[PDB]
Amino acid sequence: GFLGAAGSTMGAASMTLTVQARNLLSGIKQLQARVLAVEHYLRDQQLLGIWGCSGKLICCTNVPWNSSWSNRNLSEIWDNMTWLQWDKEISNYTQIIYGLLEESQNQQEKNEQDLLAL
Amino acid sequence: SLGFLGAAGSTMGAASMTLTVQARNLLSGIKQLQARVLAVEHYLRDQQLLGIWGCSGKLICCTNVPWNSSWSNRNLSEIWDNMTWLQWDKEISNYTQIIYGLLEESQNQQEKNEQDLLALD
Amino acid sequence: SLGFLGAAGSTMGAASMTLTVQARNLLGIKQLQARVLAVEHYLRDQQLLGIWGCSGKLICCTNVPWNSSWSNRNLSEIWDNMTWLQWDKEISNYTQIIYGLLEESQNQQEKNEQDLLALD
Amino acid sequence: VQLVETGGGLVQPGGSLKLSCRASGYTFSSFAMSWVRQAPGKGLEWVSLINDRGGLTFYVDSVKGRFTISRDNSKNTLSLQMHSLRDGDTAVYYCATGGMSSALQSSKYYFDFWGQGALVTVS
Amino acid sequence: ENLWVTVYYGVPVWKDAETTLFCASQEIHLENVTEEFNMWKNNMVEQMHEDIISLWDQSLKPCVKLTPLCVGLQCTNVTNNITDDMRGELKNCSFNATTELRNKRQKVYSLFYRLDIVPMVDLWTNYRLISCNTSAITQACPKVSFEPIPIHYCAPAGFAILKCKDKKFNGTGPCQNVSTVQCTHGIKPVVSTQLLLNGSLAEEEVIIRSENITNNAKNILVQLNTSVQINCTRPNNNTVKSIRIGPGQAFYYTGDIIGDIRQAHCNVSKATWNETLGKVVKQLRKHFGNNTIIRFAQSSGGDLEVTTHSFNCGGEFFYCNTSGLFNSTWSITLPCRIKQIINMWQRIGQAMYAPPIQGVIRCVSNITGLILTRDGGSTNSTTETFRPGGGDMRDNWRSELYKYKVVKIEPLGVAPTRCKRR
Ligand SMILES: *[C@@H]1O[C@H](CO)[C@@H](O[C@@H]2O[C@H](CO)[C@@H](O[C@@H]3O[C@H](CO)[C@@H](O)[C@H](O)[C@@H]3O)[C@H](O)[C@H]2NC(C)=O)[C@H](O)[C@H]1NC(C)=O
Ligand SMILES: *[C@@H]1O[C@H](CO)[C@@H](O[C@@H]2O[C@H](CO)[C@@H](O)[C@H](O)[C@H]2NC(C)=O)[C@H](O)[C@H]1NC(C)=O
Ligand SMILES: *[C@@H]1O[C@H](CO)[C@@H](O[C@@H]2O[C@H](CO)[C@@H](O)[C@H](O)[C@H]2NC(C)=O)[C@H](O)[C@H]1NC(C)=O
Ligand SMILES: *[C@@H]1O[C@H](CO)[C@@H](O[C@@H]2O[C@H](CO)[C@@H](O)[C@H](O)[C@H]2NC(C)=O)[C@H](O)[C@H]1NC(C)=O
Ligand SMILES: *[C@@H]1O[C@H](CO)[C@@H](O)[C@H](O)[C@H]1NC(C)=O
Ligand SMILES: *[C@@H]1O[C@H](CO)[C@@H](O)[C@H](O)[C@H]1NC(C)=O
Ligand SMILES: *[C@@H]1O[C@H](CO)[C@@H](O)[C@H](O)[C@H]1NC(C)=O
Ligand SMILES: *[C@@H]1O[C@H](CO)[C@@H](O)[C@H](O)[C@H]1NC(C)=O
Ligand SMILES: *[C@@H]1O[C@H](CO)[C@@H](O)[C@H](O)[C@H]1NC(C)=O
Ligand SMILES: *[C@@H]1O[C@H](CO)[C@@H](O)[C@H](O)[C@H]1NC(C)=O
Ligand SMILES: *[C@@H]1O[C@H](CO)[C@@H](O)[C@H](O)[C@H]1NC(C)=O
Ligand SMILES: *[C@@H]1O[C@H](CO)[C@@H](O)[C@H](O)[C@H]1NC(C)=O
Ligand SMILES: *[C@@H]1O[C@H](CO)[C@@H](O)[C@H](O)[C@H]1NC(C)=O
Ligand SMILES: *[C@@H]1O[C@H](CO)[C@@H](O)[C@H](O)[C@H]1NC(C)=O
Ligand SMILES: *[C@@H]1O[C@H](CO)[C@@H](O)[C@H](O)[C@H]1NC(C)=O
Ligand SMILES: *[C@@H]1O[C@H](CO)[C@@H](O)[C@H](O)[C@H]1NC(C)=O
Ligand SMILES: *[C@@H]1O[C@H](CO)[C@@H](O)[C@H](O)[C@H]1NC(C)=O
Ligand SMILES: *[C@@H]1O[C@H](CO)[C@@H](O)[C@H](O)[C@H]1NC(C)=O
Ligand SMILES: *[C@@H]1O[C@H](CO)[C@@H](O)[C@H](O)[C@H]1NC(C)=O
Ligand SMILES: *[C@@H]1O[C@H](CO)[C@@H](O)[C@H](O)[C@H]1NC(C)=O
Ligand SMILES: *[C@@H]1O[C@H](CO)[C@@H](O)[C@H](O)[C@H]1NC(C)=O
Ligand SMILES: *[C@@H]1O[C@H](CO)[C@@H](O)[C@H](O)[C@H]1NC(C)=O
Ligand SMILES: *[C@@H]1O[C@H](CO)[C@@H](O)[C@H](O)[C@H]1NC(C)=O
Ligand SMILES: *[C@@H]1O[C@H](CO)[C@@H](O)[C@H](O)[C@H]1NC(C)=O
Ligand SMILES: *[C@@H]1O[C@H](CO)[C@@H](O)[C@H](O)[C@H]1NC(C)=O
Ligand SMILES: *[C@@H]1O[C@H](CO)[C@@H](O)[C@H](O)[C@H]1NC(C)=O
Ligand SMILES: *[C@@H]1O[C@H](CO)[C@@H](O)[C@H](O)[C@H]1NC(C)=O
Ligand SMILES: *[C@@H]1O[C@H](CO)[C@@H](O)[C@H](O)[C@H]1NC(C)=O
């Protein structure tokens, strides 16, 4: 169910991404609410697009993980944490991570542009 | 060449070549804004539903869900050469939600398999 | 680091490095009309890229060859010696032909890929 | 279906030769087309295949860098342009219909409606 | 057969759906497409009705209210060369009106129609205006008009309008000649109660449309292929005067009449209306038995808005009497009355005052259809009677929207192919 995996561990909650999806899109106040929901959805989709993750729910990237963001191992991160606690732990670095993700895509397309130019 | 819905009465094979003509026509005082928001919401729900299936950015999307003979047992010649999209859509009523669920599950498995394949050093 | 449209007066080969800066800045009745028209312009551009098979990309290479009748210039003068505004003015009223060719090329590519993926 | 080769029949080693097929008894644009080669006394082998729309071409490795196969749905014409012909390419070249179909058609993966065959000799 | 699901976007499939349409002020033919239409389930009619009500109500808000009127007034017989037909129909009435100053009064006289006045027993007065005990009266702004300017209904993006072009389409059932449009043709919101004016003509014969041709409670819409020209007129050179009744609120009234006073008559040519009724009967005989002798009769009594034919003319709101028509056993002049305090949409609480229009009014309208209500009693005989009648004012727009349907586009679909991913 919607947000049912919020209290589950991240390893289990990552398999319900399509359940959390679809609930993002569906007298002046109702129209403002609809426009706001559409605007937030499109901002998130554009943010994925500029990272090279468009059309995917689980997108792997080329940005290495910095141990200063979190020094936990994968077993502790994925089996002993929920997404809410993880989101709280690394919120102070989230925008930095986003910037790095954007930069990686800026390089990646240029490399592809060169590889297809041979 | 045939117009917005000119291929509606043509066969499914012929009509499959006019997808962009119809795709362009899905996007283009309080009630006018309500109509525009409804059009945007329908477009975005369809694009999201394609994205869930891994079909984002394509108008013709091949998938990994096998066709069940209980949905329709017609061969490809009858479906594509002797039938229109309206008659076909009528034929597969009550089955589209099963197909959509199977496509969603198949793409979730595809994403997990791709993530695991990309995790090999 | 230059900011929104900061590269507008730079050359095309330099301004092409700041596409994400422009992309991130594209998103009571009058206020709703302005927000809905901004959303509609964004969605029409994204649908148009999708029709061309360029969804999810900012720099998208295609299979349409360049016609010498559209702009009889070499890459050095186009990319290193002129701006995107001058280019946009130079190829005005040629963009609809290019868009039609891109649409047809993507339709042919989708049919070819479907046929290639139909081989056992 | 009266599929008839109108190509040449004598070339020097290292030269080029064009073959073509004309069809009349079937819808040309509805079928894939191919060329199949029969060297004397060695049986038959497939050489090249083209899709029904003409956008896709496939070759055996021994000719991939030398032969170009093309088709024109107008005038119902198949063409094969062979460059750098070798002594091993002396054979009867037959037109064939099928061997491929689009995703919206039933499977074939077989050859039908064979032509009568052009004889190509490399001196 | 080793078939796999392939998803297509841009699929030419649509489903019946209704939504909000744009009011504006091309056609693509669909070969081998048969669509089912139903003009009595088409929500474009209800939306057009509600939109016209909204525009009507909004147009009367920024206008002069007549609450300084609705006083007792003393009426007498008009002194002029008045014919017999106009005796008692027009009265010369006087009243005390307010001025631009709160503490001033003026004595004003004007000519009112009898239908705008109700008798009242009081002292120094003997009449009052109608719709003063109930509702309120708002004067229509003189700077606007009621001309039926054609409008277009346009579907929103994601929707399409299907148009049926079958020459003999009867408003329901399958249609084989179908085209797709984004906007309808220009539709004139002409307001009439018994005859359909300035509408569309049929390509062939006469088209008889009814939700249930055997149920007497449903109306029959008759659309002709040829128009019948109706010429109407108010042959009286009325001189219109105006007064200020408040700080910037001006009231318009009939001041006087120059020349003799005669009725407002409307002429229907005999040589066209005859044989037009013959064609209507010939097509009615396609649904009723050949042994039945179809007769026409004047409508039954009741409210004036339904017993009379009340087409708007220019700015006056003529209420012609159609007893000269639809009287047979299958030049005609008909006495056309007028009125000024109008309950336009069969509503109480929104009475509108139509100001008199200067000079003579001579309208030339095209009759393109009409509304029949049958005998009502459905007599089990061979003398079936058709009376004209009205409705809820939506049939006037069904006569134009009958050929349009709104559909929602379903661009997403699935189909088996031999295309496996990977
Ligand atoms: C059906 O259509 C006819 C023809 O369009 C309508 O008659 C037209 O009505 C308009 C408005 O009533 C007339 O305009 C008027 O013209 C005079 C010219 O002096 C002007 O002073 C007025 O202010 C107004 O603009 C127009 O002349 C008239 N056309 C003809 C040929 O007579 C008719 O009213 C329509 N039917 C109904 C029921 O409305
Ligand atoms: C309506 O009545 C008014 C007053 O009852 C008439 O106005 C008077 O008309 C006479 C002519 O018959 C003049 O001599 C007076 O001077 C008028 N008085 C005022 C105050 O105007 C008016 O003429 C009548 N109108 C009609 C059409 O009968
Ligand atoms: C309009 O108002 C005038 C006065 O403002 C009315 O005439 C007077 O009526 C009173 C009734 O009590 C008489 O006593 C006066 O003699 C009248 N005035 C004159 C000068 O004779 C008149 O009746 C009002 N008319 C209407 C229709 O309301
Ligand atoms: C408001 O006044 C009107 C008349 O102006 C009243 O109309 C009456 O209607 C009934 C029919 O229902 C008739 O029998 C009466 O004769 C009418 N009255 C007159 C004076 O002719 C109407 O009833 C009044 N409104 C209300 C709510 O009572
Ligand atoms: C909550 O924690 C318990 C601990 O055993 C676990 O069994 C349960 O599955 C958890 N809830 C969810 C929704 O995963
Ligand atoms: C990790 O982060 C620190 C500061 O948070 C930074 O100095 C360091 O360079 C980062 N790691 C890499 C590999 O760049
Ligand atoms: C992860 O770190 C924690 C530190 O609390 C440790 O207890 C745990 O064993 C570690 N896991 C692995 C797989 O090394
Ligand atoms: C984030 O920063 C705020 C103040 O900048 C600090 O109070 C908070 O604890 C920080 N979060 C983490 C997870 O360290
Ligand atoms: C309608 O059907 C006929 C059948 O002969 C076909 O030839 C025609 O192409 C069809 N219409 C369209 C628009 O394809
Ligand atoms: C088709 O649907 C039926 C419904 O029970 C199911 O049993 C069958 O396995 C399905 N076919 C395939 C190939 O999965
Ligand atoms: C498809 O099925 C129909 C009906 O059974 C049959 O007539 C037709 O020949 C079949 N076609 C193929 C290619 O199997
Ligand atoms: C879908 O279900 C309805 C329910 O009665 C049925 O009438 C209809 O025929 C079904 N669809 C098909 C294609 O059989
Ligand atoms: C403006 O032109 C000069 C000329 O060389 C160039 O050096 C400078 O970088 C240009 N400005 C920008 C923003 O690129
Ligand atoms: C585009 O190129 C073709 C040849 O490649 C030429 O015939 C055509 O005229 C060119 N386009 C224009 C607009 O001139
Ligand atoms: C491009 O064309 C211009 C036009 O004269 C010329 O000056 C310039 O040298 C050319 N550059 C190249 C790299 O060919
Ligand atoms: C097309 O664009 C060029 C670019 O300068 C312009 O000169 C030309 O006038 C345009 N064509 C028309 C018909 O305006
Ligand atoms: C005024 O008109 C009415 C209408 O019927 C009539 O009964 C009355 O006798 C007339 N009075 C005069 C004085 O002409
Ligand atoms: C309208 O025409 C259709 C055409 O099939 C017919 O079935 C239907 O009974 C007709 N209805 C009326 C009221 O004439
Ligand atoms: C459909 O209507 C159009 C209107 O122009 C006409 O040309 C066409 O012949 C009609 N077709 C049929 C089959 O009635
Ligand atoms: C109108 O229909 C009648 C029916 O018989 C016919 O006689 C007449 O010629 C038609 N007129 C036109 C203009 O189509
Ligand atoms: C009309 O209504 C009557 C009411 O009983 C019904 O019997 C009849 O079948 C209806 N006819 C149509 C055509 O709907
Ligand atoms: C109506 O007909 C009568 C008959 O004589 C004529 O006097 C009158 O002027 C006509 N009016 C119009 C408006 O045609
Ligand atoms: C109506 O008046 C016009 C003048 O515009 C005249 O030609 C026509 O014959 C008249 N028709 C009738 C029925 O009086
Ligand atoms: C009634 O008369 C018309 C006149 O032509 C005829 O076509 C129709 O068939 C007749 N009906 C019957 C039931 O005989
Ligand atoms: C129309 O005129 C006739 C002529 O006698 C009359 O009987 C009928 O009542 C009139 N209609 C109205 C609504 O007054
Ligand atoms: C109807 O027509 C008859 C035929 O003579 C006539 O006597 C009668 O007066 C007419 N009805 C009206 C209301 O004029
Ligand atoms: C009515 O009379 C006035 C008197 O001034 C005149 O100006 C006007 O033209 C006349 N109108 C008609 C329609 O006779
Ligand atoms: C009325 O009918 C006549 C008949 O030819 C036509 O010329 C005229 O345009 C029509 N007027 C309207 C407003 O429909």
Author numbering:
A (entry chain B): 521 to 546, 572 to 663
B (entry chain F): 519 to 546, 572 to 664
C (entry chain E): 519 to 545, 572 to 664
D (entry chain K): 2 to 52, 52A, 53 to 82, 82A, 82B, 82C, 83 to 100, 100A, ...
E (entry chain D): 32 to 56, 82 to 141, 150 to 309, 311 to 395, 413 to 504
Task: Copy text verbatim from the article accompanying this structure deposition.
We found that adjuvanted protein or mRNA-LNP immunization of rhesus macaques with ApexGT6, an Env trimer engineered to bind Apex bnAb precursors, consistently induced Apex bnAb-related precursors with long HCDR3s bearing bnAb-like sequence motifs. Cryo-electron microscopy revealed that elicited Apex bnAb-related HCDR3s possessed structures combining elements of several prototype Apex bnAbs. The primary hurdle to eliciting Apex bnAbs is believed to be the low frequency of bnAb-precursor B cells possessing a long (≥ 24 amino acid [aa]) and acidic HCDR3 that can penetrate the glycan shield and bind to the positively charged surface within the Apex epitopic region. We designed a slightly improved germline-targeting trimer, ApexGT6, with affinity for additional PCT64- and PG9-class precursors, and we evaluated B cell responses to this trimer delivered as an adjuvanted soluble protein or mRNA-encoded membrane-anchored protein in RMs.
ApexGT6 induced mAbs possessed structural features similar to three prototype human Apex bnAbs. Beyond the HCDR3s, RM018 also exhibited extensive glycan interactions with the heavy chain framework regions (FR) 2 and 3, as well as CDR2s, similar to CH04 but with the heavy chain and light chain positions reversed. Our finding that RM018 had a binding mode sharing features with CH01–04 bnAbs prompted us to revisit the idea of targeting this class of Apex bnAbs. We concluded that JH4-variant CH01–04 bnAbs are an important vaccine target and ApexGT6 has the potential to prime precursors for this class of bnAb. In summary, we found that Apex bnAb-like BCRs induced by ApexGT6 exhibited structural features similar to those of three human Apex bnAbs. This suggested that ApexGT6 might be capable of eliciting multiple Apex bnAb-related responses simultaneously. In the cryo-EM structures, we observed a dependency on the engineered V2b loop, where several germline targeting mutations are located.
